[PDB]
Design a protein around this nucleic acid. Sequence first.
DNA 1: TGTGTATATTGCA
RNA 2: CAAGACAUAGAAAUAACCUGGUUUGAGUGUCUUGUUAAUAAUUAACAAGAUGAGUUCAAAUCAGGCUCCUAGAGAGAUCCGAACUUACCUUCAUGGCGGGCAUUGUGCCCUU
DNA 3: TGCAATATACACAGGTTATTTCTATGT
Length: 1063
Amino acid sequence: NADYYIGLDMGTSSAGWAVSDSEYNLIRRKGKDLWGVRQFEEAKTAAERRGFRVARRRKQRQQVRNRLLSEEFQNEITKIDSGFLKRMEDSRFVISDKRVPEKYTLFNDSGYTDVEYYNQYPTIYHLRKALIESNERFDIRLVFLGIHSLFQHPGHFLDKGDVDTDNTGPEELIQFLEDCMNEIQISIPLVSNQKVLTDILTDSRITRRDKEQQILEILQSQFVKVLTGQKAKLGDLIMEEYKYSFSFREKTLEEILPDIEGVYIESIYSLYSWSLLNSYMKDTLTGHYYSYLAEARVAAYDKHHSDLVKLKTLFREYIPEEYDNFFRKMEKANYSHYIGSTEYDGEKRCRTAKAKQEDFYKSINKMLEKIPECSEKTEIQKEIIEGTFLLKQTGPQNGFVPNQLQLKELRKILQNASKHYPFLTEKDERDMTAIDRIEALFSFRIPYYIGPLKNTDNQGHGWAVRRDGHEQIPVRPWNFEEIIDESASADLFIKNLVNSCTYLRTEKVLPKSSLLYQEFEVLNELNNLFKSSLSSYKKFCELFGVKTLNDTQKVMAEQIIEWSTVYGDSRKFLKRKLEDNYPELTDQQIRRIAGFKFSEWGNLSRAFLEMEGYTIIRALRDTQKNLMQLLSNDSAFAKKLQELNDYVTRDIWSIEPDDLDGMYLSAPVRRMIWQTFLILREVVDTIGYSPKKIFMEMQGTKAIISLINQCFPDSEVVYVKAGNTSDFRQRFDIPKSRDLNNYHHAVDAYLNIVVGNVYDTDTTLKTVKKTAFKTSPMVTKRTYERKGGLADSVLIAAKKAKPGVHLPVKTSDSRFANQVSTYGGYDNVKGSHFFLVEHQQKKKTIRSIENVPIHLKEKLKTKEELEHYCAQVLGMVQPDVRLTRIPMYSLLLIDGYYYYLTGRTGGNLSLSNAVELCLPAKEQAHIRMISKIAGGRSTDALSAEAKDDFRKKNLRLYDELAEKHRSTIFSKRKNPIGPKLLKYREAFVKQTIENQCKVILQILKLTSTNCKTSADLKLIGGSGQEGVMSISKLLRAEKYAEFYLICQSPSGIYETRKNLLTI
DNA sequence: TGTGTATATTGCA
RNA sequence: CAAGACAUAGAAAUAACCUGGUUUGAGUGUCUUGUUAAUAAUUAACAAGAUGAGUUCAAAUCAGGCUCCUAGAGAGAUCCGAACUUACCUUCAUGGCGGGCAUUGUGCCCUU
DNA sequence: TGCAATATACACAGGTTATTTCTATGT
């Protein structure tokens, strides 16, 4: 009949919608005004979820490496201690919960135990120093332990250098760099200023650029502009534009060895290599440097010891009564809290969370104040400012340690053991000894383009290409090149990220430098008639010799463009592809191919460009053609498109589950669009026909107008300029009080229908004004099942953990699931949804609303499953599940007041206000103006007689807001506020303007549906968390006069009240 | 942020 | 003078890494007096006084799922598991969710 | 002598490399 309109105000946390005819005056359906505010939560991005996924895979890989490393030492360790590998696995458990009841974690011999092992080696670095320096035959368990600790702390893999160097001081290798004097003679001042040259380049805190400028002032390309880390020009390497620029940070000389072949020759690597390894290993007492990182930590261990005796003497000499509170006692950020353990008065060790030195340093500064100034006090205060006082080896500050620095200790420890344990040098079928495998395991990490090495089910992101006959074979560092087709899988990694075709949907686009795609741009410009060019042909005819490309070298040429784009840089792939497939090209030909680099992709695919309409690429050639009429309905090429992809537009009207995937939409936008569809799908069907127009307002909107244009094609979607609606609120006096209620979202959607259809194209104003101030809009909240973490991410202390309330470490392990107060557990166990169960408590039939935990959601879907859960776990007598799913934030009507079932509070149910406050339109402007003063704007620069008006207007509002909480719907809440609002009335007058306007907004937090109901009415004398309402878990029929559950559809058109006291 | 949740305080008959 | 050469900055998705952190356990605490105990003096228990140490390691790190067993505080695999989707009712259908007035306080009328 | 209604405290995070989409600038 009469076509209607739909306006939308779509936002990341709420979607407002409105329905109107050609003359506003909202359409009426099911006896309701057809507008409302669909509210929900902002959708979480996948970045956090990806954080745990990669962390899980990293933990999985670290567990395999620990397993494989243990199998290398498995046979030799068994000869002395069979259970050593299993003793380490039994570490968390108390002596009564481990497989073998042995007290100590690692060593359980007669002479040697954990107490004796730490007397010889107080720290792991002390063990490693013995493992490296000493040539005595060590116990294989100690050798394994030293190697194992390096595996736990491998260091970063960012620095590309040659650990393989045996040993060479900076004085020695500089002499080699003096050689090759074919330069402008900068290589000799390498020896002259070597003392300043070595330390300045080694210094790890000097900025690399500032380090670069100062050194050349004494050495006066140059290679002195590359030590920072950047591309290096080959202008001076005995023969500019032939850069093949290598940056020492990005690529290894061995990797660039084929690149530099056929051309200050190679030793310039060593000086840069020296800087990376020895930057952080500089001795302070002397001028030299340590050899291995273990040697640098025993020295740091001894400085911390020397720092401790200074603090102990200072405290005992000056404040001996405060000595006991800082060292032999656990408090906030004292020394014991810093170390994380304490042992005094013969009591057991009190191991807790460790303190950060920032708060620990602050604790000494406040603690030295009561000591009069002296030499030691100034000296200790000096070190704290420098940050070198009482340092610990492990912590967030060890992000500098590279793998090559740790690889040096691995080789030295393994080499020192080969002279004593022959099992490390027994070769095998691959001619690899144990050392060749441990060293390979240590430094080998999967390259970023391989991804996960297995796809048990095709549900993950894995794309690795296993070679034929190598499936279901574990990948090792030595098996990596055989099992995994590294070139083929790296092709997929780039390919999967490539965009899809603009018109066709199943084929990836072609490179923008590909031959046929380079054409499509030029004939597009030919029709327009230059901003485009056809240059790949101009470029590729040099390689092939022939000036004009035939049809047998064009397919030759296009495979190179794809390879030079998919395999950009990383010449081990491009060169391998050419050499094996096409051995015809010579060395200069291959090197010239790497010379040009294109890595951009077009908007269209190869399959689309060669479609048999009656090839579209030739269609732009023979005729002049129109830019968009070629693929429009007026032509036969459009029909050819639909046959290639059987997918239909809009999918199905009633089925559009996840059509938003692949459109590069953030998770907040995807949820915000989807709930918009849940409304329109429910309005166009409740009404008979489809809306003539759709108005919307939130540049990614172009991706949004499109996918909705699929829905209801006959509609005329209109986008209204942002800020146009706010102009209507100004000139036509329609204030928007965002802090009052959520009705503005509906009005914003409603006004969207007004600015539109008038910007594009009586008493019209009166109808809009009357509608704009209506209380009609139906505000719904998206009910859902809570997703995310099952509980808190980290375990809490066993002292703070109690059974039943805290999720154990492992539920399937009876050791953890039964001793939550012994091993700790996960706090705040999140629940998915709620369900209603009727049980007999105190020999009386009552009902309670219990929750289904997120970790039990899948096995608790049926009523029989839920009843069994109540009987055994919840402990209910004769359970009878009446409702199986009460979602989170479900509407409840309790004693006439509407709430939201947000969560739970121990034995209670947390509720939030679901009722909208409605103040008269005159006080809407004052609240909007109150927020700005509380939001930062100052009342000091105000008229002396406009400020007494401020107090009185504020007084009237507080007096009015004291009435809605007294005699209105807002008087039926739990924990009422009206009695308390009058109680603090004398403190509302007796306060400044700013403070008495920061409580008005806090009061308004008690009648807002967007936030949890609570108020910071502490300025007027109440509490910072005031007004929280929380009913009991049990629905006693005598306590509540009524208790419903309003199940509303997303538009709210269909409601269903389920009396929780009956059904 | 903001909030779900355990935890704590406060009357109170 | 718009490309480009680049730089830098941010967002999104994915992959590969590091430092940790957290929890539990290990890293033997020792002396003095007093009280009360077992039994001339000791060994505990407890309380109050003191006192010396301290830097690390091991294992787990969403619950869990997956393969195989010949069912275990078992092996395997090293990847699935914190993002996105769901009102309610049914034969799970392009089904249903009665017909209408109000719209500042959660109502009213006609029907089943 | 609990006990219901109110009010309170608080939570894993800081870096790195690479790719592909997508902007922002000056340079």
